[PDB]
């Protein structure tokens, strides 16, 4: 509690300090961030200010200040992680700390003004089974830290051992017997085996094939799946004799991240148009579609080199359920089944959502497919019943539906969890869990936040892309982090939702596929067949529903974006920044591709922002110096426009109230287009401001547009300005986003936390019980509650 | 026996879609077969031991309890043999689709306490049945052994404790292990050499010096004990210091007690619906803890004055009660007051009585409208708080966890036991007696209770052939809500038999003159004998000189006094060598409830059907305890007996109150009598589902008697001695107030693993209870 | 055997703390101060120590940030720049959170030690001339004088690495 006393400098400062407090009791019954808290009466302030010294701490790091009677709270974040908050009053002396629960009380009655025995949600309880590290460093590095409980628990314990010798005993798969047969009772003939079996083949050649000794092995009780030649049988059975005797953290992931498992994958992806071609740009549809799709090609690839390496055939099948669309015209998403581009074993699998009255043909936004899941869960499992040979080995989550319904499949079919969020909407529509209530109608938050919490805790493993999306930075607070404490007044209070430090989080960052993203400067490389229809596309003096106004001065350096279109990708709101300031209009031309004009429009969003960018044109005379695009569905001619920007020397600019990750982002650096970016979520971590990009403020937007000209303005003047962020970006992308080391890490994952499932098992049986009457008695009602779409 | 078994799972499948209990599979299927029977082997056992089967048409499924709280459950096909194993919850889905057509939700609700109460091991003995503070003693006692980081919470406890600001035990002083070891022995010389009278003002000056606050005791001798006791504790635990010491440490000196239901008062009330036992069993409480209480306070040299609130409802509009004042002292006690607080809504407070089964949607506001009113008669909070039936039980639950209070729960009867079946069928019992609500509250403060109090050990684990009444709530669903895989485990150490008594001033032997009240015959005489038929009596004894077959009772279908009317109206020789009467209801008013009213009609019937004018007196509510004693000592006088008759009972308060008085008792099997009475020894037992029997019974008990008189003597003696034994009230205080010591303390320990099961049974009370409480209509002035 | 008595056993970490804090040479105190007393000040410290030295060049000598670390209750040897004190103090915080083998091993060898050595070879005629080759004198007179020539470069080394 020492923040609370850096505050009690009211007793030095306090004609100042209790200033500030008091230009916020001037804004009322509210609250408002840091760019709210601090840019008030600290900036708007006078040199009667002076307060640079010690109060700068509460101010500088506080996450949100919440205006109310006489009393005004604040939230102090010391470190990520770490919460103390607190409320003074205003004018008035006398300032108390106040616990989490009360400080929510607090934030109910800004809205109600007033249920006694409603609700308290708290993890914490349910979660003390290993401990948890206080350090940052083991944040988004969970399984570093369950590796060295592991081993610990593991070291000389012979209960504690029984447990992985069960999991290679049991361990199959479609019936076949892998790692250990029957045969093996307790850890005596373990040891004995082991030991007679590296004797035997420390003698034989490096490269001699498993089928040689597979004789002799079977007849001492040992299984395939050990690995295809000698050396490497030696080497995974010197491995566990290793974790037998004095376990250690890098040899426990070592041996699990090898033992056979993944095989058969499954993953949720229901929203949205999922497909391979003409959808990308449509509401919903989007990076965790290309995020998926890049995903299962790796994985593949990777799948396939271990099952040969560890000598089997096995032949692997990866499905992506998704819903059926019988009626989207144009697309692929009306059929069931169908291959993933260049993979041998990817199949999307659609599934449509269904009512007693039949199947449910329209598509439905993402916010309100809600009441559809359960039952697409119980007729999931059965198509993908059909399909598979086997059981599901690992089920990935996605989003919030995705991640609701792999929770209830993986309860199901027993079979381990991984959860991959995307984004996560309640830091994207800001006070959206105060103000739940009066946005329920429209963007039923209610149940979205319920299948959050649920499948956050009910998931096995987490992956997220960046550590931002977890604990976020020094100043500001993650994605996850902000679900620890919140309050939906009036339906229930988090009081513990989730914990920074859990050891599931695990950081695996993405990349874009490097056939369809390289540098301009490749000329071999250049698909110059596409020039013409890109000539077409920003040069032409056809207005129509593909592209809108025209650029008259076609030699100007172009400033580009591309995106969804709906309210927090903020397209209008770059429009109008460039609109507003003449120098930049005067250095570059404005490209924006967002939404689809094809065909009207079914989305809110979508439709409210097309109405805007409408009037901007007219508003601002846009036409000459801007281009709006329609949406483009084609990855491959996407990489050639990524370049062909780099052609004119412009830069990639994305201005989202918030962006939860970003790939256009990694993907505009990837091709070697200098990029701005919003410092609202994942492109904060992505780009090194200066170095490999600019990060620019959504909420100062006259800025954004005036810090573009300056860099227009430098390039103009030093051409090898441009040269060098292009480079910065170029290599920030190689050291961190690529999908290479990607699968690899998920498959380790999933190994590890497979285990790691069957020895805890014990006490996450409260947590079990728990999610389970969360989801039966809160989701279930809730989502019965939202609306049946209409045929 | 291959060719055999698929024949009895033939009878048992021509039964058709049902379950059958063993009162009727084997009761129909073993016997009723040909003499292929040769079942003496293995195979018999299996089925002679099951509670029930379900049978469908593939398939029947065995739920088997071999020994008390111990169950399997198993599937067969009817043909193909081929016997597996089934999970609970797996058993469960059959009593699904027997009702539903269908199992429940794939995803809908299964309550699981199990993995919850795992903290402490469980014992596997049916001795530590009903035993747990024996057990959780035990316990405390190892984890306390030599372990620094397991001796610190009794530190802690100790320091901490405190009453309205007056600090007792340890003082702030000591802060560790070693100057509490060091300062109990500096304690212990001192008093080692003073005279064992020396006051607590004498050495208080030097015990306040070296951090020792006030309570070890009233005089020095009493001091040095306790002293001791806590240096064994540091030192060498064991299970009976251990409790002696917590059981010594003041706590206890503001007991709330809930029982908002029926009208509860000391005069003028029981025979009403919904008003009995229990409140007879709360006074006769109160009146003995008061005076334990003020036992233990004073031993401890302290002056504090207790306080016992009986939290009940106002009723304004009951009339010839007391039940429309917000306090009253009880009788016989100093500190004893009832505390009535309205049921109100939005639209204001509400007059009218309302039912046990539709008070829940009222639970709630009354927990906070109470709490506020006992805030203001109490003297700091309380040290205890005692839940009382489902709606006692309910609200005992929230105020505990509202004002951190210690809580003990008695049930007094749970109906799911009641009304058989009423789990599985009770969807269509709903709209009437809304099962749903009041089992969920059933399950839901069992669980949030500190400790659990029964009257017998029949209540928890049943007997060696039948089931126990929270033995029966362990597995069950209710189809379409949700199903319940674990609800409580009748090993668990929270169980705790307690027997309560009958107030020995009140109820005595037949044959102690000076004692009897005779100012009460001229009254008792008209009551029985009189040829005057009203409202207060109904009907006539032909006859003054035949002995009395005695019962008295609320009136209504499980206590099944309609039953043993219709027994003895077809039994003529039952009926010359006795006189029924039957005492329930009170029809000197309009009856307001249901079960009341149609048991009414039943009795009116019955006595024209079977020309009961002459051997048949029917008597309305006699509701002054004391000549309600001498009455009972009067059926005595003739030679006569008491008999209770109920479908269930889930303790029998009368039954004691009979077997206190000499008068010779037979009581239903079915439930707390049973093992109350010992058959033969202390009286007998009847079956309430076979009535005949239990009138031939009876003729010949009276035949016996009229042959042999020292007969009526002997079971009249065995009954007096067994209650002497078993049922008083003298042991209960201390038991109680021990009790709340050691899991008052074992709350400071456990506290870790219970955070889990409370945050369950808050979403559980939230999600559940609220929704389906709000469902039920609201009573309308 | 250490890395897992060391995971999360408070009973278990104070050792290295008074190792730490008791660890001085000749008068002149090392590592940690008298000033920390518990593992809760200790973790404290390390992480006001970390935080500042992640800002400063990496060849900074250990003098220009000593005044500062003395304050708080940090002593000499954990390196001579503050690109070394860096690593060992996250080393040591590691061994507080997820104690390793490779960290552990890699922490105590770094932590400055070995500074007088005492070496026992009585019999023989230990010299190095005249002597190779009579009774008893032998390879271990040989082995003794390779040893301590080596082992005496390393102290060097490791004496200024530590600072
Ligand atoms: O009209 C469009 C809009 C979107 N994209 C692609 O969609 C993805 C958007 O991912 P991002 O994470 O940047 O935004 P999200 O949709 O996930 O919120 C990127 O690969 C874009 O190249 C596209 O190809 N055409
Ligand atoms: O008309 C009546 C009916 C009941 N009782 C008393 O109510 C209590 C009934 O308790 P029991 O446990 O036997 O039955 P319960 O009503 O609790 O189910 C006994 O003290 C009876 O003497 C009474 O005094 N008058
Ligand atoms: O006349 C001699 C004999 C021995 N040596 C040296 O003494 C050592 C003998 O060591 P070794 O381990 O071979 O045998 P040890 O004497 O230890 O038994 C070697 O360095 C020899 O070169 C020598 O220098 N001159
Ligand atoms: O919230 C952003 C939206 O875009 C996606 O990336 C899909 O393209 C999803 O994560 C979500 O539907
Ligand atoms: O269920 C039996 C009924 O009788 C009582 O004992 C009170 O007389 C209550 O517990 C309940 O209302
Ligand atoms: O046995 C070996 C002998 O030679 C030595 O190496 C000394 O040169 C000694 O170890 C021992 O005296
Ligand atoms: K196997
Ligand atoms: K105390
Ligand atoms: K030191």
């Not at 040689?212 to 092995?217: L, N």
């Not at 990777?302 to 692997?316: A, H, S, V, Y």
Request: charged letters at 25%; one cysteine or more; glycine letters at 6%.
């Amino acid at each position: 509690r020492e923040r609370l006393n850096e505050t009690l400098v009211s007793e030095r400062n306090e004609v100042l300090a209790l200033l500030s407090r008091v230009e916020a009791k001037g804004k009322g019954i509210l609250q408002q961030n840091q760019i709210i808290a601090e840019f008030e009466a600290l900036p708007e302030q006078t040199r009667k200010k002076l307060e640079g010294g010690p109060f700068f701490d509460l101010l500088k790091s506080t996450q949100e200040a919440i205006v109310l009677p006489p009393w005004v709270a604040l939230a102090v974040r010391p470190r990520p992680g770490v919460w103390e908050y607190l409320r003074v009053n205003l004018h008035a002396l006398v300032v108390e700390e106040l616990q989490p629960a009360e400080f929510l009380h607090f934030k109910e009655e800004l809205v109600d003004g007033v249920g006694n025995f409603t609700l308290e949600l708290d993890f914490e309880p349910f979660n003390a089974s290993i401990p948890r590290p206080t350090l940052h460093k083991y944040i988004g590095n969970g399984v570093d830290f369950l590796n060295r409980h592991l081993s610990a628990k593991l070291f000389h314990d012979k209960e504690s051992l029984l447990p992985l010798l069960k999991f290679l005993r049991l361990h199959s798969h479609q019936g076949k017997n892998l790692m250990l047969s029957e045969k093996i009772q307790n850890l005596n003939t373990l040891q004995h085996t082991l030991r007679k079996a590296e004797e035997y083949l420390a003698e034989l050649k490096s490269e001699t094939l498993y089928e040689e000794f597979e004789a002799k092995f079977e007849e001492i009780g040992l299984e395939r799946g050990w690995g295809d030649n000698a050396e490497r049988v030696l080497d995974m059975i010197r491995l566990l004799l290793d974790l037998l005797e004095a376990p250690d953290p890098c040899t426990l992931e070592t041996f699990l991240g090898r033992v056979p498992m993944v095989f058969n994958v499954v993953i949720l992806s229901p929203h949205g148009y999922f497909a391979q071609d003409n959808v990308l740009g449509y509401p919903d549809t989007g990076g965790q579609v290309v995020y998926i799709l890049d995903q299962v090609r790796a994985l593949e690839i990777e799948m396939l080199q271990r099952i040969k390496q560890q000598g089997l055939n096995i032949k692997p099948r990866i499905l992506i359920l998704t819903r059926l669309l019988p009626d989207a015209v144009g697309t692929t998403c009306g059929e069931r089944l169908e291959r993933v581009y260049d993979s041998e074993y990817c199949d999307i699998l659609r599934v449509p959502f269904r009512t007693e009255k039949g199947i449910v043909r329209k598509w439905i936004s993402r916010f309100e497919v809600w009441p559809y899941l359960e039952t697409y869960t119980e007729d999931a499992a059965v198509e993908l019943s059909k399909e598979l040979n086997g059981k599901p080995d690992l089920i990935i989550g996605n989003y919030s539906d995705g991640n609701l319904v792999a929770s209830l499949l993986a309860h199901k079919l027993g079979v381990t969890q991984c959860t991959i969020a995307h984004a996560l909407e309640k830091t994207k529509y800001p006070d959206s869990d105060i103000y739940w209530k009066k946005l329920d109608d429209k963007y039923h938050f209610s149940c979205q936040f319920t299948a959050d919490i649920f499948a956050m805790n009910h998931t096995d493993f987490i992956i997220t892309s960046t550590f931002q999306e977890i604990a976020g930075s020094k100043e500001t607070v993650g994605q996850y982090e902000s679900h620890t404490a919140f309050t939906l007044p009036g339906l229930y209070r988090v009081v513990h939702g989730i914990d920074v430090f859990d050891p599931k989080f695990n950081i695996v960052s993405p990349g874009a596929d490097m056939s369809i993203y390289f540098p301009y400067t490749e000329e071999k490389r250049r698909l110059t067949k596409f020039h013409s229809e890109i000539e077409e596309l920003l040069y032409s003096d056809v207005e129509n529903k593909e592209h809108l106004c025209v650029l008259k001065d076609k030699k100007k350096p172009i400033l580009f974006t591309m995106a969804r279109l709906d309210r927090v990708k903020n397209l209008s709101g770059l429009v109008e920044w460039y609109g507003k300031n003449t120098r930049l209009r005067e250095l570059a031309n404005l490209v924006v591709v967002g939404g689809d004009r094809r065909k009207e429009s079914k989305d809110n969003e979508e439709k409210a922002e097309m109405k805007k960018m409408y009037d901007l044109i007219e508003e601002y005379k846009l036409n000459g110096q801007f281009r709006w695009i329609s949406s483009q569905m084609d990855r491959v001619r996407n990489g050639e426009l990524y370049r062909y920007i780099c052609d004119t020397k412009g830069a990639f600019v994305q201005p989202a109230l918030y962006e939860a990750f970003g790939l256009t982002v990694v993907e505009a650096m990837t091709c070697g287009l200098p990029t701005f970016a919003t410092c609202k979520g994942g492109p904060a971590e992505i780009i090194v401001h200066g170095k490999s990009g600019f990060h620019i403020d959504p909420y100062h937007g006259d800025q954004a547009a005036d810090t573009l000209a300056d860099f227009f303005t430098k390039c103009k003047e030093d051409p090898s300005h441009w040269d060098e962020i292009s480079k910065g970006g170029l290599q920030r992308i190689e050291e961190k986003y690529t999908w290479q080391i990607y699968s690899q890490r998920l498959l380790t994952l999933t190994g590890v936390y497979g285990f790691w499932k069957h020895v805890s098992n014990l006490d996450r049986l409260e947590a079990r019980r728990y999610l389970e009457m969360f989801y039966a008695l809160k989701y279930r009602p809730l989502a019965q509650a939202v609306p049946l779409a209409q045929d």
